[PDB]
Symmetry: C2
């Protein structure tokens, strides 16, 4: 089967970025946002099916893949900035209000977009992500061992850039295998795209900047919303990895503290839901989008 | 001033290691144990003064500096194994019972030695270290950011070896500056010795193995002692960095849960007490050793 058949590849010029986007379909708009260390190609098992019924927009996050900040010295890689990129992207394409489906860092862009710009987000789906404020509250020995890179990549410039940049393909391949729990989920051609992006020192730097923002400004934004009692205003679906969750850490429970309309389900796969469990994800997504068709 | 004037450099052949040792003095024996990413030369501002009144033994920990495990494929780098190296070292030199002064990883060797072999340890001094069990209980977001390397270096073989090995001098120099809080504390000739050790891939691997053991077997040993109610049997002194401590985390408080005879003081310096605050350390050490002369 070919990758993203019928998708039209665009480069959008926005106020602060040059963004790679791929689009297909007609009907209500959906924006799909990948995570780390990937690109929009992570959606290749999901996006074709959705494009049969919806307007589907796939984007590389600022700094990832083929998307770049225009300021290559000191750009803002906070989730708030990347959320504004999404508003500009969808606006240019003709959409002022749209559903957002995110995985990993893209879910973090997505919920920040929903909180900051509730008029723009019709529905939100998180694939195996809860807000960073909740993650930081969960840090203990096992968390920090499991997610050591959250701490490495957030160290001050240029410590992690120097380490991860020495043998970029080794580190990329190690990371993808680990995130997949050793499962054979990566299409060899999607892999080459992830590899080429990671060989670019600007991409690696942007990734570090994402992780620095997660520690700092992104967490501060989440706290300000929590302080204000601000919640997502749209229907929310969370699809999470089947694993044990400590008290207070179950993703459905967490999302119910951030939104009044929440549903979800466990999926028996790795964290890499788009590539590992696309049929299960599709079944849940299609049902959610159909059930909230009025919201769209 | 010359480095370690009058110290006699030896290589000891023990059951499991070839150990670099430097000795000077006469009288009651003291064993001084450096930490990461250093060698016995870290004691150069302290050991000469002590050798005026005591038998002073400086050792490179197994795998650090010029000390090596005989098994270079699968050696044991647990604190228990390095504690046995100390028993063999001091025994070969003519001492069955001795005081131990440790800094950083060497304090961790030291307290494990005192717990496992209480008949051998007359007195114990910890420079800015508490037991690893207590450290792990303290892990939160800020701990993991500050001490990110505790999590990096404990990742499975050969992830951290690959990262830290790419540009060893960059990583060593970064780490030393950070641990010193930017203070100009490293004698340029001691530095060259730390650098040469870190350029050896076997040393870097042994360091990773230390950090892996800290997560695993070392913590398990501490828990077994806590479960058994086993405490250090000798007088203990702890000299700690002056900084705020959360409830339960003050080093004097912690050591009092591990030993019935504890004293200590705060020192206004970085974590690198031997090099940063040698006069303050000496004043406290000399008074402690003199006050417990009978124990010796
Ligand atoms: Cl994530
Ligand atoms: Cl330590």
């Amino acid at each position: 089967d070919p990758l993203l058949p019928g998708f039209d590849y665009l480069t959008l010029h926005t106020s602060a970025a040059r963004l790679r986007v791929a689009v297909k379909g007609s009907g209500p708009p959906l924006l799909l946002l990948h995570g780390y260390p990937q690109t929009h190609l992570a959606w290749h098992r999901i996006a074709p099916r959705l494009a049969e019924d919806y307007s589907v927009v796939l984007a590389d996050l600022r700094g990832y893949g083929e998307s770049r900040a225009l300021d290559e010295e000191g750009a803002d890689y906070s989730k708030a900035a990347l959320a504004r990129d999404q508003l500009e992207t969808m606006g240019q394409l003709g959409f002022e209000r749209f559903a957002v489906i995110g995985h990993d860092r893209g879910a973090r862009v997505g919920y920040r977009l929903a909180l900051d710009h509730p008029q723009a987000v019709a529905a939100f789906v998180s694939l195996d992500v809860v807000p960073i404020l909740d993650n930081w509250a969960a840090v203990n020995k096992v968390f920090a061992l499991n997610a050591y890179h959250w701490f490495l990549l957030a160290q001050p410039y240029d410590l992690p850039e120097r380490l991860i940049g020495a043998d970029p393909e080794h580190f990329l391949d190690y990371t993808l295998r680990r995130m997949a729990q050793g499962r054979d989920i990566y299409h060899p051609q999607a892999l080459e795209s992830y590899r080429r992006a990671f060989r670019d020192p600007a991409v690696r730097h942007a990734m570090c900047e994402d992780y620095r923002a997660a520690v700092g400004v992104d967490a501060d934004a989440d706290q300000a919303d929590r302080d204000a009692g601000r919640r997502l205003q749209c229907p929310v679906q969370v699809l999470w990895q089947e694993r044990p969750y400590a008290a207070g850490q179950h993703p459905l429970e967490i999302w119910k503290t951030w939104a009044g309309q929440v549903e979800g389900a466990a999926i028996g796969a790795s964290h890499m839901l788009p590539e590992d469990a696309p049929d299960a994800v599709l079944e849940h997504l299609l049902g959610f989008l159909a059930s909230h068709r009025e919201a769209l």
